[PDB]
């Protein structure tokens, strides 16, 4: 029996007129008579038995006075292994056309973050196979990870590489929540996981979940579909003490979607037009993505930097919540180095001499200081050149370029673009390779060989091969 009824429809905001027993805030309401299942999330009580909600689907086709049913609970999505290896919608509908989703039970997408007494924080190195990352900005298993990048910098391809290297061969499960990104990338990733056997039609397999809130979805859905993916990870965390790998696509779309409707909701725009509740709205999501006594979640979330402006309120507040940070620089891409990981801006909470080995910490700072000195010499070199510099400065610039070029690593996901097969670098070989360069092991050979190589030995063998070739 429908208690509410449509009264006002403007854009994506829809108001419902209830007769009695108004639904609590965040509750899910089912509109009857719509061609497609439309769900409304209660957000504000305007008085006089009026409630303002946001539509998850296109509001075109609705009609004032259309009956609305009250479920009495927030948007509930199917959880459990049935969602593993299947694409799901913001409201829990399967859009993969593989049939209905089997779930042992339904959990709400809204819940309170775990208390502080039961935080149970822990640090553990995560070998991702990327030498530039494993050295300068090590990742911590169970801690948030941020990939700050602009428009078309290589953050999407980087996420694919982490999945290819981290998701597979993982005892626990994995979740992939793509919010606000283009749909073309979703179809590619689905076919990629299928060919890579990460997902399959045979039940009992596909230890990975996929959630998509692509641009094709209207506002409100892109701001809550992220919670759907989180609920899947929370289920695998609480019910089973298994490490979960949460790969979150660009999250800036979440805060952006809220601002798209914040104006119509009545809120006053912020300094940059964002909603006044940006910190609280974003904080409610970050606090929930954390390790607890039951299980741990290693969340890999990307932050889109609009116009390459890191001073935007959305990403600026995210830095405080992230444990490991990976800031992508556009200048490196111009040079051809990939991944374009900014060595100076990128930081990691694990980069502490007490947490990691002293040798790992020493080699890390040695590279940063080397590059920092080279950056300062660029000014004088532009006018006078490297020749007018002293032998000491010449060696600094020489090794700095070789180390900077050596940071470039070709991965499997970049084969189609570059044409060179991917390569995996271990932590031991990574620290040893750079440590040798810092001591001048490769200062003799040309800098051309220290480009898109996995290990120092590979670069030397390539250098010798070029010699006999000529």
């Amino acid at each position: 029996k429908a208690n509410g009824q449509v009264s006002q429809v403007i854009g994506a905001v829809v108001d419902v007129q209830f007769e009695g027993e108004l639904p609590q805030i965040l509750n899910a309401l089912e509109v009857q008579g719509t061609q497609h299942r439309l769900v409304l999330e209660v957000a504000q009580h305007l008085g006089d038995s009026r409630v303002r909600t946001i539509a998850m689907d296109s509001t075109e086709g609705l009609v004032r006075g259309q009956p609305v049913v009250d479920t009495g609970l927030p948007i509930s999505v199917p959880v459990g292994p049935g969602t593993l290896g299947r694409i799901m919608n913001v409201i829990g509908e399967p859009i993969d056309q593989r049939g209905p989703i089997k779930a042992a039970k339904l959990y709400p997408i809204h819940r309170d973050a775990p208390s502080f007494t039961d935080q149970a924080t822990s640090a553990e190195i995560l070998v991702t196979g990327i030498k530039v990352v494993d050295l300068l900005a090590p990742y911590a298993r169970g801690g948030k990870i941020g990939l700050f990048g602009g428009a078309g910098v290589g953050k999407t391809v980087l996420i694919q590489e982490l999945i290819n290297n981290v998701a597979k061969h993982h005892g626990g499960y994995s979740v992939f929540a793509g919010v606000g990104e283009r749909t073309r990338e979703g179809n590619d990733l689905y076919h990629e996981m299928m060919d890579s056997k990460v997902i399959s039609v045979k039940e009992g397999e596909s230890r990975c979940a996929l959630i998509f809130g692509q641009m094709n979805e209207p506002p409100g859905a892109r701001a809550r579909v992220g919670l759907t993916g989180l609920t899947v990870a929370e289920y695998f965390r609480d019910e089973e003490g298994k490490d979960v790998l949460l790969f979150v696509d660009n999250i800036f779309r979440f805060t952006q979607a809220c601002s798209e409707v914040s104006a119509l909701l009545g809120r006053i725009p912020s300094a940059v037009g964002y909603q006044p509740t940006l910190a609280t709205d974003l904080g409610a999501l970050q606090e929930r993505i954390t390790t607890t006594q039951k299980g741990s979640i290693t969340s890999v979330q990307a932050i889109y930097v609009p116009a390459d402006d890191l001073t935007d309120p959305a990403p600026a507040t995210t830095f405080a919540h992230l444990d490991a940070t990976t800031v992508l620089n556009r200048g490196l891409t111009e040079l051809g180095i990939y991944p374009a990981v900014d060595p100076l801006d990128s930081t990691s909470r694990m980069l502490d001499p007490i947490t990691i080995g002293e040798e790992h910490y020493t080699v890390a700072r040695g590279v940063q200081k080397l590059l920092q000195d080279y950056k300062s010499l660029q000014d004088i070199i532009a006018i006078l050149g490297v020749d007018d510099l002293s032998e000491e400065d010449k060696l600094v610039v020489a090794r700095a370029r070789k180390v900077q070029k050596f940071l470039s690593q070709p991965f499997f996901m970049s084969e189609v673009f570059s044409g060179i097969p991917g390569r995996f670098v271990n932590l031991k070989q990574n620290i040893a390779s750079f440590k040798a360069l810092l001591e001048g092991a490769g200062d003799e050979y040309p800098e051309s060989c220290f480009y898109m190589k996995g290990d120092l030995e590979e670069s030397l063998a390539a250098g010798r091969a070029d010699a006999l070739k000529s």
Partner: protein, 512 residues
């Protein structure tokens, strides 16, 4: 079919004409101003539903309020008055689609403005429809030849992607679109349905005199037979400029869902945002940053996200979008340009400096990029396209050392000269599209270093003479490169030997 048989079927068709009329609710306008009409009553009206006024002009009910209804006038609002009647049609906004659309010029609503005759079409699709899901889509693996050397080589466009033509005023944004339409005309003549590409040109906020000149060029080259022009001029009401992009997009979905390939070209979207902003501001809605509505990002995203490459299960159709963006002073950090860049796959940056320095098309390859990459290029193109990018990359670096001067190494002199040949090679005039196979030959000669012999000022004329010489004497070679699409070793040896030979035969300036 005999004349008598067709006439009988013609008469029978006219006989079977049905016309049913039902009770339609009507409301009165509380107020009318700036094209916004507040309607009283008119309940049980759907969002975006079409409504007709007393004069006969249509309207779209966007704001459904408990007190009144906010309607937008889809035309001139001089005849509208207080208390006038507003009749709801009962159907969401839609436009006619089909094959008869090709060869005509329509408006935002779809009415033909050419004056030739009424539109003979029976299929009408809704303007705004949910974009395809994730499964219906498919990886882009077909090249969309635009006819431009730099584009087909450095920034390849595959059928089903989204490329952004971003630049300042009078930077060659429209020239790129015209060259593409002209290039696809050849494939339309020859019986290769797998390469036919229907072109759709959406004009938003443009002077009619310019659009008139645009259509004449298409007819001049006979490229209008497969072109569709949607006109939403400045005098047109803001909703028309707001719906014209989605209107033309619906026409493209026809070819998309029918296994065909269609190319839609959205003109400057900043003008759409002004109309969409104007339409939103007049509705008394709270404005966002830069006075634009909060959901302006959803506007372009919903529009461009529809362009995709359908899977073989639905016919293998594809829709390619080429949205255009006009920048004020080359500042891409603005709000609207930044959003569009993040939505589209690749973007073509146009520089005013390169334009006046003789680099036309003024394309900044350093920033331009495409997600599809070499996946769209043909075999004969990927091989040569790879080395071309690397060579150009080095030349841009040594550009500064030229000022330094006072010395030049032997290799640097070669790399500096070699890069100059490529830049001079990639230049192309307006309304002069080139065939895919012809570019392979010219681009091949450049990377190999043969162009380093003759003077730079003579490389452009060599291109014309060289291609003409090949078409006449060496015709089987061109056929292999076209059919097979791969540059075999036998062609490499033959091509590598005739290129230096031809330069010596013809009368050119050989002194480097």
């Amino acid at each position: 079919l005999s004349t008598g048989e067709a006439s009988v079927v013609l008469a029978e068709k006219i006989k079977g004409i049905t016309q049913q009329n039902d009770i339609t609710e009507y409301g009165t306008v509380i107020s009318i101003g700036d094209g916004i009409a507040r309607v009283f009553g008119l309940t049980k009206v759907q969002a975006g539903e079409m409504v007709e006024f007393k004069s006969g002009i249509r309207g779209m009910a966007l704001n459904l309020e408990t007190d009144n209804v906010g309607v937008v006038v889809l035309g001139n609002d001089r005849d509208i008055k207080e208390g006038d009647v507003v009749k709801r049609t009962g159907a969401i906004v839609d436009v006619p689609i089909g094959e008869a659309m090709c060869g005509r010029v329509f408006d935002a609503l779809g009415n033909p403005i050419d004056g030739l005759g009424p539109l003979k079409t029976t299929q009408r699709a809704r303007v705004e429809i949910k974009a395809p899901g994730i499964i219906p889509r498919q990886s882009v693996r077909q090249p969309m030849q635009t006819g431009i050397k730099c584009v087909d080589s450095l920034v390849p466009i595959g059928r089903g992607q989204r490329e952004l033509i971003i630049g300042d005023r009078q930077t060659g944004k429209t020239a790129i679109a015209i060259d593409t339409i002209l290039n696809q005309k050849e494939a339309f003549n020859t019986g290769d349905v797998k390469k036919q590409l229907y072109c759709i040109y959406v004009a938003v906020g443009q002077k009619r005199s310019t659009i008139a000149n645009l259509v004449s060029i298409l007819k001049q080259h006979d490229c209008m037979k497969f072109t569709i022009v949607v006109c939403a001029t400045a005098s047109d009401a803001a909703p028309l400029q707001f719906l014209a992009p989605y209107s033309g997009c619906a026409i493209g979905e026809f070819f998309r869902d029918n296994g065909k390939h269609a190319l839609i070209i959205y003109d400057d979207l900043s003008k759409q945002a002004v109309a969409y902003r104007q339409m939103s501001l007049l509705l008394r809605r709270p404005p966002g940053r830069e006075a634009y509505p909060g959901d302006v990002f959803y506007l372009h995203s919903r529009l461009l996200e529809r362009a995709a490459k359908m899977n073989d299960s639905l016919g293998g159709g594809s829709l390619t979008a080429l949205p255009v963006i006009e920048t004020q002073a080359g500042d891409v950090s603005a709000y609207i340009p930044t959003n569009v860049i993040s939505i589209t796959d690749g973007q073509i940056f146009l520089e005013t400096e390169l334009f006046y320095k003789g680099i036309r098309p003024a394309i900044n390859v350093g920033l331009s990029v495409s997600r599809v990459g070499s996946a769209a290029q043909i075999k004969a193109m990927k091989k040569i396209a790879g080395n071309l990018k690397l060579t150009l990359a080095t030349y841009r670096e040594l550009a500064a050392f030229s000022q330094f001067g006072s010395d030049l190494d032997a290799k640097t002199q070669q790399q500096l000269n070699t890069g100059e040949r490529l830049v001079e090679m990639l230049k192309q005039n307006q309304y002069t599209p080139m065939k895919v196979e012809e570019q392979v030959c010219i681009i091949f000669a450049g990377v190999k270093g043969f162009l380093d012999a003759l003077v730079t000022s003579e490389v452009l004329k060599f291109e014309k003479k060289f291609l003409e010489h090949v078409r006449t004497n060496h015709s089987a070679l061109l056929k292999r490169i076209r059919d097979s699409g791969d540059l075999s070793e036998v062609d490499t040896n033959e091509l590598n030997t005739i290129i230096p030979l031809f330069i010596q035969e013809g009368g050119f300036k050989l002194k480097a």
